[PDB]
Amino acid sequence: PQITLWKRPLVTIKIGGQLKEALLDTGADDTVIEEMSLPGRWKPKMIGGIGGFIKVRQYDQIIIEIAGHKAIGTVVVGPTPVNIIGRNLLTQIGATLNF
C-alpha cells in the first residue's frame, strides 16, 4: 500500500499468534512492543526516546507479521505508549518514504 499521514499509520501485526495494533514509525530504529510473553532468551538494551532512556528486553529472531507482510527479527519489550514498528522491520517489509 501507499499510506498517507493525515491519520496515525496504525496497522495490525501478529506476534505469538495474537493480533495487535502497531504504529509504523520511521523515527524508530528499533521495534518496541508492550509487555507480552515471547520465547527464548533476552538480552538487555537501553533505548533513548523523547523523554529519556529506558531499559528494555531484546528478543532476537522473532516471527512477526506486519500488515500481512512476514518479518523475522529483533523486538524489544518495554513501556511504550503504543507498539511501534521501527526501521529494523520496516526494511524487511520493503517500506520506503516517498515525496
Q: How far is the CB of 92 from a second copy (least distance, A)?
A: 10
Active site residue 25: yes
- Asked if residues 62 and 76 have their Cβ atoms less than 8 Å apart, the reply is no
Round to whole Å and give the CA distance between 42 and 58: 5
Identify the DSSP state of 67: T
Q: Which is nearer to ligand 031, 17 or 46 (CB)?
A: 46
Residues paired with 34 in a beta bridge: none
> Strand 18-24 and strand 83-85: pairing?
parallel
Site string for a second copy, 7-26 (x = CB under 8 A): -xx-------------xxxx
Q: Check binding of 21 to Na ion (CB under 5 A).
A: no
- Which residues in this chain contact a second copy in the complex, by CB under 8 A? 1-6, 8-9, 23-29, 32, 47-54, 67, 69, 78-82, 84, 87, 90-91, 93-99
